[PDB]
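Re: [help] complex structure
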Amino acid sequence: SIRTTRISATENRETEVMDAAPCEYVANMFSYWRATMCYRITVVKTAFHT
Amino acid sequence: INIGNKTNENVISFFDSTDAETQNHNALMKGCGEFIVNLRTLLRTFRTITDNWILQANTKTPITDLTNTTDAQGRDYMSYLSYLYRFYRGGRRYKFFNTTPLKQSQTCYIRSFLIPRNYSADEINVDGPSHITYPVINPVHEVEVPFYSQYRKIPIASTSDKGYDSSLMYFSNTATTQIVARAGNDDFTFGWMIGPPQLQGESRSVAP
Amino acid sequence: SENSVETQEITTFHDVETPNRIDTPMAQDTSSARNMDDTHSIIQFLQRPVLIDNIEIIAGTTADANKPLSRYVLDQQNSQKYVRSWTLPSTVLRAGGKAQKLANFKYLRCDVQVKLVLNANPFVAGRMYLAYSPYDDKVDTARSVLQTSRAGVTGYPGVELDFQLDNSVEMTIPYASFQEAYDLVTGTEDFVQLYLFPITPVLGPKSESESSKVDISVYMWLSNISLVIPTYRINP
Amino acid sequence: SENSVETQEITTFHDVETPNRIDTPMAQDTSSARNMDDTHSIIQFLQRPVLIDNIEIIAGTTADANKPLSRYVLDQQNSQKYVRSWTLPSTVLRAGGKAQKLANFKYLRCDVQVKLVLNANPFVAGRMYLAYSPYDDKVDTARSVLQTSRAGVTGYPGVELDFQLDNSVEMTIPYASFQEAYDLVTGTEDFVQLYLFPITPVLGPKSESESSKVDISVYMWLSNISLVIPTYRINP
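Output below.
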């Protein structure tokens, strides 16, 4: 996500702000990676949605 | 088939050629050599926390005049893993690399001492366990602060209590600008895991 | 020195001597694509289910998808009304990119599987019937499924397709032709020709702005296949 | 009743119950396409030799096909003169309809075979050399085969190609890349790049209307292959 502030009448600063999963947050330290990923997809449904 | 819900947890997998743990040894033996396992091992390597610290001549300076600033950034490994944890125990090894345009009409030397945490300059004594180097013959100041605490562990940025474990005081004679690097000692370790805060990217600052 | 007759896949050579062939010093293993997946044979590749059709029913209904099965069929104009018509195996071979993977072959001995994943809300009832009829558009007019009565349609082989009891059906449509081993080049295969009939009309509340949907899908894949003779052609 | 998780080739399902599947009463064997040929796997299918190139030499010669190998190469304009250039495996994969049979895969671990069937009259002599050079049009200029001397060209791996002694050569070009398992989708493979050099000029009687031909042909096929990851794309 990009944060846009003001400095002068015609100049701004766009600072990149990233989210960080704990798998992501460790990987920023290191350069090259290799990992078996996982994902747990959950549906938030009622008793009646199919 | 009835109206209701179950949980029936499914760990279903994709590609299943070989066991994962076997290929990771074979992949690092040809690409790395070194096999990084535990993050406790990264608190033993001296990463440079500053590039320049222009210290005014003849002043007993606590490192907390730099530590309160440089625990925000997370540039090293101590302050970058200050966000994934809450408590810590263990002493902090410090190394000081001299980068001063030295002058021959003086005899430059470096002292070091102990203060408890977050005291100011004049409100502590000077006779304690010391160390001394001479930067004409030895540019590196090789100092380790022990872990002399009242409590078994310390949370980060505590309340109005102060002076509850020990840290460094840095005394010189001349206006020596330096490099400061650090990591924890042999028994320095974090604990009590939480989730991580955010990260900051590039700040190119385009005009419109 | 005289006998150089070697054999490839389907190919043989005839030279004077073994033509002084050099090769690798030692065949050392390299990058690990073998360790990531096992090799999928061509008989293994024609057993992958494909998303063919996606049929949505609303009751409704203005359209032909909920005209129920006629009790009697008195004339060929008022033939039996259905949902869709799959003319096997000419549908299952073209879809899923299979025909661009069984090119340069000639004869095929397949068994078509059919599965219906079904997903409807609990407030909707009804029942369908999934009949197949071989040579249904080749035989004389009176013998087809589309000309017989409701007792004659249901008497064909198939499976019940109730909503609340069946969220999946497994039907095995056999190798049902008189010709040995289906031709592919200049193909006019169309042997078994599938159908989908609603027996009862789909039922829901007669007040609208309620959206009573059904949303059927169809999966097909081959089984017990044998793919034999190599050629140079194929139909596009 | 709760556990309906079945497995296709590379595909898994998740239903509430086993959806009341009906099938064939008895799976009786039918027409005998299995008895006429055994099924050819996809690793078996990428081992068929293909007729790629058909090179004819007449001595002659006005053309570049009998400029002999230069003893020295002093400048890049006067580079080394050759016959043809095969940029493997991008030649062997496109030809023989192989790329329309390894579509919907991703990674490949091949070894390219090369055979030269040769057929010339007894009244013609000469000698050629079949060198391969990996990354020959990727590395810096001085390291390619086309810029080195005659002793440097022949020092590359290859085989002698004399007429009267060799009517067939067998060369095994290995898996010679740094990337594990060649990419196919958005492919720029071109790793090993083959060549064909004449060492001596082809010799025959200097009186013409005699037709001293050579007529080389080239066969290539893959070996020790592993074809692993499934995708939906491919390059045309």
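The CA atoms of residues 109 and 180 of chain C lie 8 Å apart.
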